[PDB]
Design a protein around this ligand. Structure first.
Ligand SMILES: *Cc1c(COP(=O)(O)O)cnc(C)c1O
Ligand SMILES: *Cc1c(COP(=O)(O)O)cnc(C)c1O
Ligand SMILES: [Cl-]
Ligand SMILES: [Cl-]
Ligand SMILES: [Cl-]
Ligand SMILES: [Cl-]
Ligand SMILES: [Mg+2]
Ligand SMILES: [Mg+2]
Ligand SMILES: [Mg+2]
Ligand SMILES: [Mg+2]
Ligand SMILES: [Mg+2]
Lengths: 355, 358
């Protein structure tokens, strides 16, 4: 028995992997792997387009947005965004809700004026700040948020109505885990390796008209928009796998259906914490609790380590919290099945009963 | 019948793919795919390290060089190289031997002073210029070359001895197709998808002391130092692509390494160039003979109607990828390491029959 709670890269749907295995040597009767196709072939172009189409359908992405498939991870987006939009006399305004927010802010500071609209850093990122607290500037280039704060286990329940500058979100750890109103954003980005696919491709959803002389060709959004993410060779297998994952989400009923599964998964772990009479304590304020990364600790470090060691012995993978914060983190992205969360509960109850 | 002459991504050695298929769901007894593992797991770390160690052994990479695995393609390297080394007061000096050379130069121009050391552009890139032609500057930041000019079908036979600045090479389409004296270079880069397997990873072989220092003003992800210090694990790497690279490198080693693959590549290139040369001008190769690539064989028939008819027949007969690059037309047989010799035999037979029946 293995239970895959890895935080990134992460569990993928079994049907998507089984499909990939079956046709790894002979894709679509071509007698070649999808990995052996030219990216300028109709065979590959169909897959590329179908990944975009499924994202568009599943997230209900309006026609005035384009869907980009880029290399470099979300971390490259931390610099590519200000490189394109943080122009002279404008401000890259950030809401800090965890360490990933901080890493994005850091890259903008190298390129122009920045600002902190709001922050829960002083309280160790236990919550999402009230939107009424945001400090906005007329010359903001954008307002950047982190929808799901992967290390801290907090998540935006809803998104602010921002009209003075585009809203930009790092959705790496919760994209397509629930329906979204894409019209609230100027740009959304996410490495694929938590909810959408394997590592090596980054999805960027951008309002077309939003997006640069002096910027290197590969680092302009415009390059990729105009070329439909085929300016240079894309990560063809990663985009194929993304397509397979998106087919799986569609087959189960789409974003509302996966949201219901993810809410049940999270409920199992949070009820276990809440009913534990303080033996397990979550990091996040209840009102900010993530459905994607559940962070918690036991009453002392010795017990934390004992629990994590027992989990590892019993086949659980990935539960150690991020190094920077310690404790435990159960990552329960889309393809983590409910039975793994049940198994984690049962382990948690047995461990407490035998403590 | 399928014959895969795709130019990028391209044929993989079947055992690398069969290995990946077999263990796609349960890698190293973990009951997870390599695609589902942490990059900090022992199972992945072993793959990441073995890929480096296989490249090191196969190319005889000295210990003062590091192997980086980066995202972004060779195209991102066209900007990352000048961003890190083209400093104020210095020149990015380029040898133009094809379109990919031009694309690299274009990115440097956005960032600093550039120069053209030598060029065969005026003659449509039929050859590699003689090294005696190279115009060097005392303030060169580097001299950049393209070892195999993938669109034009020409290739360096050997490499210049440069002492005034580091020699940098885009080796995307011929890396590890033959032995290489890595110590001639300050940096070598290659998208993996021509001769080393997967798209989505770029191999960068760097002389550590040339590039391990922070570069003021350059974004974290775009500094070589970031990736050198973190062993290409600064952010999440393209784990499946690096895994597949490992599998391809295991295959190259198994077949006898760089020396053995060179022998194989020379043989299968000769099959196609002999067909051209014995065709009494029915097929005309683009490259001058002294510069002919072992990796991309470029040619035309006597007019565009015949080119179209040949390519249409090829496709009907199961050949994939023979259309020349859009920018130049004609035909291009890409014959990277993993293209089997019997595909080259089949192409010869197609070419002879088409000639005879024309
Ligand atoms: C996973 C993660 C990242 C880092 O992504 P890379 O692809 O490794 O650069 C960035 N932001 C958030 C919120 C993450 O969860
Ligand atoms: C394939 C190729 C490139 C482009 O590589 P990408 O990974 O698509 O950016 C650059 N240089 C040469 C010589 C090539 O053959
Ligand atoms: Cl975080
Ligand atoms: Cl994280
Ligand atoms: Cl070229
Ligand atoms: Cl090419
Ligand atoms: Mg918290
Ligand atoms: Mg379906
Ligand atoms: Mg209850
Ligand atoms: Mg071996
Ligand atoms: Mg055969």
């Amino acid at each position: 028995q293995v239970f895959n709670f890895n935080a990134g890269p992460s569990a993928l749907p079994k049907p998507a992997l089984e499909r990939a295995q079956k046709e790894l040597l002979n894709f679509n009767d071509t007698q070649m792997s999808v990995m052996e196709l030219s990216h300028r072939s109709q065979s590959y172009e169909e897959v590329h387009e179908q990944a975009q189409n499924l994202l568009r359908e599943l997230l209900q992405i309006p026609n005035d947005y384009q869907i980009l498939f880029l290399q470099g991870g979300a971390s490259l987006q931390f610099t590519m965004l200000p490189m394109n939009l943080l122009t002279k006399g404008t401000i890259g305004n950030y809401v800090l809700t965890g360490s990933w927010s901080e890493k994005a802010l850091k890259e903008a500071k190298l390129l122009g004026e920045t600002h902190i609209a709001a922050s829960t850093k002083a309280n160790s990122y236990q919550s999402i700040p009230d939107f009424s607290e945001f400090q906005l500037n007329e010359n903001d280039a954008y307002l950047h948020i982190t929808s799901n704060n992967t290390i801290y286990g907090t998540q935006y329940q809803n998104f602010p109505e921002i009209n003075h500058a585009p809203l930009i979100a790092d959705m790496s750890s919760d994209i397509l885990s629930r329906p979204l109103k894409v019209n609230q954003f100027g740009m959304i980005y996410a490495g694929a390796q938590k909810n959408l696919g394997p590592s090596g491709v980054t999805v960027v959803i951008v309002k077309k008209d939003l997006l640069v002389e002096q910027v290197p060709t590969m680092l302009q959004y415009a390059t990729h928009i105009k070329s439909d993410s085929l300016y240079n060779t894309p990560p063809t297998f990663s985009i194929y796998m993304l397509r397979n994952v998106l087919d799986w989400i569609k087959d189960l009923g789409g974003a509302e259906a996966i949201a219901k599964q993810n809410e049940e998964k999270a409920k199992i772990i949070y009820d276990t914490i809440d009913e534990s009479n303080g033996f397990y304590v979550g990091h996040a304020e209840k009102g900010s609790r993530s459905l994607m990364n559940v962070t918690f600790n036991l009453r002392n470090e010795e017990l934390n380590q004992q629990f994590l060691a027992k989990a590892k012995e019993q086949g659980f993978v990935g539960l150690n919290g991020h190094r920077s914060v310690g404790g435990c983190r159960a990552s329960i992205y889309n393809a983590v099945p409910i039975d793994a969360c049940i198994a984690l509960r049962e382990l948690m109850i047995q461990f407490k009963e035998n403590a």
